[PDB]
Amino acid sequence: ISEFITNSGDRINTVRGPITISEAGFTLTHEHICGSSAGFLRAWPEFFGSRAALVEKAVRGLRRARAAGVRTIVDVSTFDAGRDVSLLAEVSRAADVHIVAATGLWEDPPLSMRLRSVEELTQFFLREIQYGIEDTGIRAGIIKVATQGKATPFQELVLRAAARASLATGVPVTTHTFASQRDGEQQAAIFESEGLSPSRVCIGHSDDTDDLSYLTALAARGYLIGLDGIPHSAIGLEDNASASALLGNRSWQTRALLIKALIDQGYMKQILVSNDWLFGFSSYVTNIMDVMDSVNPDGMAFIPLRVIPFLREKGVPQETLAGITVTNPARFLSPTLRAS
Amino acid sequence: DRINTVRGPITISEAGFTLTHEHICGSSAGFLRAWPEFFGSRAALVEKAVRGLRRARAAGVRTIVDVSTFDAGRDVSLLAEVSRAADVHIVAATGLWEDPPLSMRLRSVEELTQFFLREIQYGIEDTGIRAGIIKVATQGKATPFQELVLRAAARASLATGVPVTTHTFASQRDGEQQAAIFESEGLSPSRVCIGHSDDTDDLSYLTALAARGYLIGLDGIPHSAIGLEDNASASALLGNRSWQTRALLIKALIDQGYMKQILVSNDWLFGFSSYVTNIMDVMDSVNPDGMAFIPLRVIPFLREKGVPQETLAGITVTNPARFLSPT
Ligand SMILES: C[C@H]1O[C@H](C)CC(O)(O)O1
Ligand SMILES: C[C@H]1O[C@H](C)CC(O)(O)O1
Ligand SMILES: [Zn+2]
Ligand SMILES: [Zn+2]
Ligand SMILES: [Zn+2]
Ligand SMILES: [Zn+2]
């Protein structure tokens, strides 16, 4: 009964305020409006044409995803990935797509973050969840962390601060990995040493690897498996070294068949799916957004328009795919009880 | 005849006593807006900076050059607020310092030139405030990216006439490589201040650069961890050379004939998030005068050493005006 009720119930924080779990609907759990650096969009909007051009591009892309069935995206851009929650709020209002914002730290923390203690980082993550991001009053609904191989000492502090902020607030944790180095195993160990439940943790970029034994072992432990870069592929771009390095030479079909593989092995309840798409991208080579748009014009609509029909004709039931894209994110994003 | 400040253009005569290398807040891009509680609050940081700049004003300072770049967390709206409430002119900087994020590190020399030009010719962010100086940095031999920054800085200077000021590891003679790259872009040494030059005792390094026409930034005079020997992080940052040793380098360059090429400053801050947490309190504990240290302590020290008042006025008024005036 309660799956049909939207006018009441517990709530998820978005850039427009709280929404009921029922209102979240079809949710992409790992996306970006703009992948940049702190302060960069405000200091150099002409890099993106203009701020107005970036807004219009993102609103059009979100409307395309909405027409394909998407109702919510989780923008997992952190402070150091150039998250501008005022941009997120504007595009969310114009496109009528819910956007959950993130705290945490990604791969490019400045000195003012890298010098901080685990206790200090915990306070910063709590600030963005409990008080608001900058002076906007927009509260983060997820904590994003990253490793690229064995964690640096600072990344260990970030992982522990994320776990502590998660336990204190009930909001979940989502991660960036070098999946080929099995990063999720060390991340899980650090999280478990802090007492975090695996059901509150998504191990991301997990479709970057073909090692099913690594994925199934984490899923068996209760971790959520983020198969979040399905359209990332440089097939056809083999002469472009920067695009090939970023997007890989594995096909979207290969990535999508990892979804089916985990389903077939009984782990559908542990899967989250996304595009890891962007509408602007300044933290890499200059032409990269144009290159990416050239091989995936559907943008964030790729999951509903391409991956769902592909898996359905492979025999995955529609209700299973709805469970992965609607119910699984709702359980993940719903805040659990705070500790104590 | 005009210099851009955070309150708009001023004439050269209005700059007066100028501190050429200072910071309202040494931070990181976006950090002051995302975590103002690190500084107590934004309001507390404003009040502290206004109290400190008012003290420097009472000691005779009329202008400071805030050489915080984008990646040092420059917030020009903060600079404007503090400048207005302390009635001290503040010149803002473009360029890049020692902590550029990916969105900067991945850019070409052409792209960096466009960004520096934007901040000088159009404005910083959406504020309309235009930079009056370009700040660059090396820490020993330049990285490939720092070479691009130095070249883009030279190109932006040649297009606008605003000068270039540098951060160096003086002990590794970085001013020589900076000079070489600047001259390979056709930049005139008289448009360049080689900063942190008081961090070294090698007078022959400094006089050779000045004999080539460079301005010499003796800009960290109160930086000293004397008395803080049990503090490893403060000692590493501030050094164990005394302020008197640094100040006597001013006299030495005057005595060697370079008074017209010396720029003096404190390299002080009112907030500081890019190092260890307690560093601002530690620094305030040994230099409560803050930015007033140059006028209150260094000027009388040099006067009693025999430096004429006209020479000290030339260093603190004439040289910054000549340096900051766009060519
Ligand atoms: C900023 C964004 O760009 C990449 C495509 C992937 C990421 O998720 O690591 O972050
Ligand atoms: C004092 C110390 O922090 C400042 C932000 C910059 C510096 O490089 O001048 O050194
Ligand atoms: Zn990532
Ligand atoms: Zn991502
Ligand atoms: Zn410096
Ligand atoms: Zn400085």
Residue numbers in the entry:
A (entry chain B): 26 to 365
B (entry chain A): 35 to 361
What does the paper behind this entry write?
The enzyme phospho­triesterase (PTE) is capable of hydrolyzing such OP compounds. Accordingly, it has been characterized from a number of bacterial sources, including Brevundimonas diminuta (Bd; formerly Pseudomonas diminuta), Flavobacterium spp. and Agrobacterium radiobacter. The present study focuses on Bd_PTE, a dimeric metallohydrolase that has a (β/α)8 TIM-barrel fold with two Zn2+ ions embedded in the active site. Carbon dioxide reacts with the side chain of Lys169 to form a carbamate functional group within the active site, which serves as a bridging ligand to the α-Zn2+ and β-Zn2+ ions, both of which are required for full catalytic activity.
Apo structures of the octapeptide-tagged A53 variant were obtained using three different crystallization precipitants: AS with glycerol, PEG 6000 with MPD, and PAA, which resulted in crystal structures A53_2, A53_3 and A53_4, respectively. The residues from the octapeptide of subunit B made contact with Trp131, Glu132, Gln173, Phe203, Ala270, Phe306, Ser308 and Tyr309 in the symmetry-related subunit A. Interestingly, although the crystals of A53_3 and A53_4 were obtained from different crystallization conditions (PEG 6000 with MPD and PAA, respectively), both crystallized in space group P21 and both retained the residual octapeptide. Since the octapeptide was only seen in crystals in space group P21, it is reasonable to assume that penetration of the residual octapeptide into the active site is space-group dependent. The presence of the octapeptide in the active site might be expected to interfere with the binding of OPs. This indeed explains why no OPs were found in crystals of A53_3 and A53_4. Additionally, an unidentified six-membered ring ligand (X3E) was observed in the active site with two O atoms, likely acting as a chelator that coordinates the two Zn2+ ions present in the active site of PTE. Interestingly, both A53_3 and A53_4, which contain X3E and AA, respectively, in their active sites, crystallized in space group P21, with the residual octapeptide pointing into their active site.
